[PDB]
RNA sequence: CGAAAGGGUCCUGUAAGCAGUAGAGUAGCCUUGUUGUUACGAUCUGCUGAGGGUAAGCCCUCCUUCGCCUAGAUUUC
C-alpha cells in the first residue's frame, strides 16, 4: 500500500479515505474528503482557495526550491530488493525529514521578518495619539502621597512611582450597574 | 474558611448550555441558566440579576446570546426582617476586553 | 499499532482520542467487523462452543497498516508529527 | 553525503543562526491603550440602543455628585481644591 | 440564472471541464473525439456554431457572436488565461515529481 | 466532583486595522508631465492556514486556577 495525495488540496490520502472520480478521457481524481470533492464538482479552482497547497505554492508560502525535496518521487523504474538499501533508505528518510523541518522553519522566519518593525511603528503612533489614556494616579492618591512625603521628608515623585507600580501590579475590572436598595 | 459576604468573577460558557435550544426561548433560558449557575456557585437560592446584565444577555435579540459572559457574583447578607434565606447573590455584568482566557477570580473587598 | 511493513511507532488510540471513550492504555483486542454493543459498554468474549468448519477460522491474519487518524472528523494524519510536518510552521510557533 | 556537505556548509555560513526594553515598553503601552479603547467601546455598546429607542438627553438627567467625583478623581483632578459639594444642588 | 439549480451538482448535469477545454483548444483531435461522442443532428444549429471556450453549441452565428459579448464567455476567457488546474500543478504544489529513469 | 483555563483533535476559510511605484479610469495643483504630483476608486497583495468555533452525547491535565465534601428527609424480616 501507499499514501496518495488529494488532487484538490494536497493532503495525505490514506486508504479508505475520500473518493475517486473517473473521467471518460482517462483521468482519475482522488479526493481526500467530501469538502474537496464537492468543491471540485462546483468547479472551484484550488489555486484560488486559500486553504490549499495549490494556493500556497502559487503565493510562494511553501518552500519549493530546496535540495531536500529531490528525494521523493514516483519511481517508474523498479529496483531489485536489497535489505541494506532499504535500511539506509529508512535512515535517509529520517535525516531528510529533520533537515527539511529545520529549513522550513528558517523559510517561515524569512517570511515573517518585518513584523517587529511594523508593530513598533504602530505602537509609537498609537501612544503618540493616546498619551491621555496612559495609567495615572488618582487626585486623592496624589494628595495623600503629597502629605505623606511632607510628613516623612521623602521624595514625592518616588512615592508616585511606587504607587503607580502598585496599581500596575493590581489589575481590577469594573462591573456594570449596581444594586438598588430596597425600602 | 470562606466568609458569607464574598464576591467572585466568573466566566460562564452559555454556548454549551444553550446548544440546541429553541430560538424564541434561548435568551430566557440564558437568564435561567445564569440563575442556576449562580445558585450552584454560591449555594444561594435567592439570585438577583442586574438590569445591565439582562440587557447584555438580550443585546442581539432573542436568539443572539453570546457564547461566553464575564460576570461578578456577590454573596451578601439579607438584612430584611422575616427573610426566608439569610444570604442572597447579586450578579452583575463585568466590563472586560475579552471574556475569553480569564480564570475565576476573587474580587478584593476594598 | 505498528506492523511489519508500517514502521511508524504508534499506539492504537486515534488522534484526539477515541470519540466519547478516551484512550486505550491497556491490552486491547482487535476484532474483525462489528459487535453488538456501543462505546463504554461491557462486552463478554466467549470461546466458540463447537469446533469450526470454515477456512476463515484457520486463516492467519497479516496486518499491513492500522488507521490511527482522528475519528472526530476527516482526519488525514496518523501522528501529530505527521500533521506538523505537513502543515509547517504556524504563527503560534514563533509566538511561543 | 552531498546533502550533509550542503548542511555543514550553510551551518558554517550562518544560515540557521538565531538572533529592546524601550520597544517592549512602547508595545505594552499600546496594548494598554487598546484595552482602554475596547472598554470604552463596550460601555458605548451597553448604553446605546438606537435601533429601538433614542437615548435620553444628558441635560434631562441629573448627574450624581458621587459619580462625577469618582470620574474626575480617576481622571486626576483634586476635587477638594475646587469644591464640587457647593456646586451640587439638592 | 441557472435552470434547475437544485439538481445542479448531479453527475447527470455535469459540464465539460476547463482542462479538457484547454486540450481541445491546443489539439483538434481531442475536440474531434468529444464531438464524435455527440450526434450532429440533435445539436443546436446542427452543430455548426460551437464555442470551444464555453464548450457550448448555439443555434446561430449571430447567437454565438452575441454570447461572446457576454460576461460568462469573458469569465471563461480569463480562466483560460489563468490556466486550469491539472495533476502536474497538483504534484508541483506538494513538490512531488515523476522519475522515469 | 463542579466551574473556568491550557494543550490536543476537528470545522470553516485568511479577521479587524494599517500599508503598498498593484488597480480600469476620472478630477484638480503645478515641474505641464518625464511612476508629473495629489485626491477618489470595485478589487488585489502583505502582515494572516490567519480570525472565529470546539461538547452541548470529543480527548488529556495530582504537577493551570477557583470553589464543594463525612449531609438533610423517609423507610426497613
Ligand atoms: Zn483534499
From TrEMBL, chain A:
Disulfide topology: 6-9, 9-32
Gene Ontology cellular-component annotations: nucleolus
GO biological process, alphabetically ordered: assembly of large subunit precursor of preribosome
A GO term for molecular function: structural constituent of ribosome
Residues annotated to bind Zn(2+) 1: 6, 9, 32, 36
Binding locations of Zn(2+) 3: 36
Protein residues bound to Zn(2+) 2: 32, 36
Metal-binding recorded as keyword: yes
Residue ranges constituting the TRASH domain according to the UniProt record: 6-44
Keywords for this protein: Metal-binding, Ribosome biogenesis, Zinc
Family: Belongs to the eukaryotic ribosomal protein eL24 family.
Protein name: Ribosome biogenesis protein RLP24
UniProt source species: Chaetomium thermophilum (strain DSM 1495 / CBS 144.50 / IMI 039719)
Covered residues, full protein: 1 to 183 of 225
UniProtKB/TrEMBL annotation, chain B:
Domain of life where this protein originates: Eukaryota
CDD domains: Ribosomal_L31e
Annotated SMART domains: Ribosomal_L31e
InterPro entries named in the record: Ribosomal_eL31, Ribosomal_eL31_CS, Ribosomal_eL31_dom_sf
A single Gene Ontology CC term: cytosolic large ribosomal subunit
Molecular function terms, GO-annotated: structural constituent of ribosome
GO biological process: cytoplasmic translation
Keywords, ordered alphabetically: Ribonucleoprotein, Ribosomal protein
Entry similarity comment: Belongs to the eukaryotic ribosomal protein eL31 family.
Alphabetical list of NCBIfam families matching this protein: PRK01192.1-1
Protein name: Putative 60S ribosomal protein
Organism expressing this protein natively: Chaetomium thermophilum (strain DSM 1495 / CBS 144.50 / IMI 039719) (Thermochaetoides thermophila)
UniProtKB/TrEMBL annotation, chain C:
Entry superkingdom: Eukaryota
Residues the record lists as binding Mg(2+) 3: 71
Listed transmembrane segments: none
Family: Belongs to the universal ribosomal protein uL3 family.
UniProt name for this protein: Large ribosomal subunit protein uL3
Species of provenance: Chaetomium thermophilum (strain DSM 1495 / CBS 144.50 / IMI 039719)
Taxonomic lineage of the native organism: Eukaryota, Fungi, Dikarya, Ascomycota, Pezizomycotina
Segment of the intact protein contained: 295 to 390 of 392
Automatic annotation (TrEMBL), chain E:
Coiled coil regions in record: none
Residues that hold Zn(2+) according to the record: 51, 54, 67, 73
Family indicated by similarity: Belongs to the ZNF593/BUD20 C2H2-type zinc-finger protein family.
GO molecular function, one term: nucleic acid binding
Principal location: cytoplasm
Keywords per UniProt: Cytoplasm, Metal-binding, Nucleus, Ribosome biogenesis, Zinc, Zinc-finger
Record Pfam families: zf-C2H2_jaz
Protein name: Zinc finger domain-containing protein
GO process annotations (BP): ribosome biogenesis
Superkingdom of origin: Eukaryota
Domain C2H2-type span(s) in chain numbering: 49-78
Annotated GO CC locations: cytoplasm; nucleus
Compartments where found: Cytoplasm; Nucleus
Amino acid at each position: 500500500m501507499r499514501i496518495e495525495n488529494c488532487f484538490f488540496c494536497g493532503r495525505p490520502a490514506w486508504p479508505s479515505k475520500g473518493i475517486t472520480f473517473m473521467r471518460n478521457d482517462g483521468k482519475a481524481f482522488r479526493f481526500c474528503r467530501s469538502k474537496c470533492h464537492k468543491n471540485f464538482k462546483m468547479k472551484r479552482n484550488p489555486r484560488k482557495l486559500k486553504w490549499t497547497k495549490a494556493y500556497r505554492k502559487n503565493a510562494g508560502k511553501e518552500m519549493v526550491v530546496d535540495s531536500t525535496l529531490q528525494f521523493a518521487a514516483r519511481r517508474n523504474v523498479p529496483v531489485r530488493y536489497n535489505r541494506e538499501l532499504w535500511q539506509k533508505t529508512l535512515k535517509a528518510m529520517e535525516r531528510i525529514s529533520e533537515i527539511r523541518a529545520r529549513r522550513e522553519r528558517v523559510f517561515y522566519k524569512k517570511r515573517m521578518a518585518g513584523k517587529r518593525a511594523r508593530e513598533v511603528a504602530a505602537a509609537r503612533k498609537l501612544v503618540a495619539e493616546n498619551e491621555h489614556l496612559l495609567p495615572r494616579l488618582r487626585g486623592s492618591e496624589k494628595r495623600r502621597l503629597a502629605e505623606l512625603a511632607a510628613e516623612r521628608g521623602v521624595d514625592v515623585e518616588e512615592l508616585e512611582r511606587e504607587e503607580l507600580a502598585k496599581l500596575a501590579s493590581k489589575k481590577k475590572s469594573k462591573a456594570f450597574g449596581g444594586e438598588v436598595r430596597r425600602v | 474558611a470562606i466568609a458569607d459576604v464574598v464576591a467572585r468573577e466568573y466566566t460562564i460558557h452559555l454556548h454549551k448550555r444553550l446548544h440546541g435550544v429553541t430560538f424564541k426561548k434561548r435568551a430566557p433560558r440564558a437568564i435561567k441558566e445564569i440563575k442556576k449557575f449562580a445558585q450552584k456557585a454560591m449555594g444561594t437560592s435567592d439570585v438577583r440579576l442586574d438590569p445591565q446584565l439582562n440587557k447584555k444577555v438580550w443585546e442581539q435579540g432573542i436568539k443572539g446570546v453570546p457564547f461566553r459572559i464575564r460576570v461578578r457574583i456577590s454573596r451578601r447578607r439579607n438584612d430584611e426582617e422575616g427573610a426566608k434565606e439569610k444570604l442572597y447573590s447579586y450578579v452583575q455584568a463585568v466590563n472586560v476586553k475579552n471574556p475569553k482566557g480569564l480564570l475565576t477570580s476573587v474580587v478584593e473587598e476594598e | 499499532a505498528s506492523t511489519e511493513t508500517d514502521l511508524t511507532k504508534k499506539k492504537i488510540t486515534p488522534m484526539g482520542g477515541f470519540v466519547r471513550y478516551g484512550e486505550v492504555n491497556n491490552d486491547y483486542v482487535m476484532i474483525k467487523g462489528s459487535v453488538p454493543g456501543v462505546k463504554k459498554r461491557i462486552m463478554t468474549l466467549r470461546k466458540s462452543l463447537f469446533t469450526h468448519t470454515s477456512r476463515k477460522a484457520l486463516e492467519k491474519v497479516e496486518l499491513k497498516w492500522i488507521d490511527t487518524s482522528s475519528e472526530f472528523g476527516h482526519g488525514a494524519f496518523q501522528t501529530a508529527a505527521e500533521k506538523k510536518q505537513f502543515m509547517g510552521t504556524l504563527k503560534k510557533d514563533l509566538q511561543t | 553525503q552531498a546533502l550533509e556537505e550542503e548542511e555543514e556548509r550553510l551551518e558554517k555560513e550562518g544560515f540557521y543562526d538565531e538572533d529592546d526594553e524601550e520597544e517592549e515598553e512602547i508595545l505594552q503601552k499600546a496594548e494598554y491603550i487598546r484595552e482602554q479603547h475596547a472598554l470604552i467601546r463596550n460601555e458605548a455598546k451597553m448604553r446605546k440602543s438606537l435601533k429601538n429607542r433614542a437615548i435620553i438627553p444628558r441635560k434631562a438627567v441629573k448627574k450624581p455628585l458621587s459619580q462625577l467625583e469618582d470620574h474626575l478623581d480617576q481622571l486626576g483632578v483634586d476635587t477638594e481644591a475646587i469644591g464640587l459639594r457647593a456646586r451640587a444642588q439638592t | 440564472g441557472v435552470f434547475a439549480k437544485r439538481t445542479m451538482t448531479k453527475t447527470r448535469r455535469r459540464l465539460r471541464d476547463l482542462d479538457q477545454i484547454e486540450r481541445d483548444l491546443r489539439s483538434p483531435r481531442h475536440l474531434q473525439q468529444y464531438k464524435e461522442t455527440k450526434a450532429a443532428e440533435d445539436l443546436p444549429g446542427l452543430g455548426l456554431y460551437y464555442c470551444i471556450e464555453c464548450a457550448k453549441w448555439f443555434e446561430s452565428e449571430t447567437s454565438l457572436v452575441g454570447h461572446r459579448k457576454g460576461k460568462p464567455h469573458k469569465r471563461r476567457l480569463k480562466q483560460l488565461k489563468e490556466g486550469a488546474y491539472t495533476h502536474e500543478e497538483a504534484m508541483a504544489a506538494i513538490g512531488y515529481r515523476i522519475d522515469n529513469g
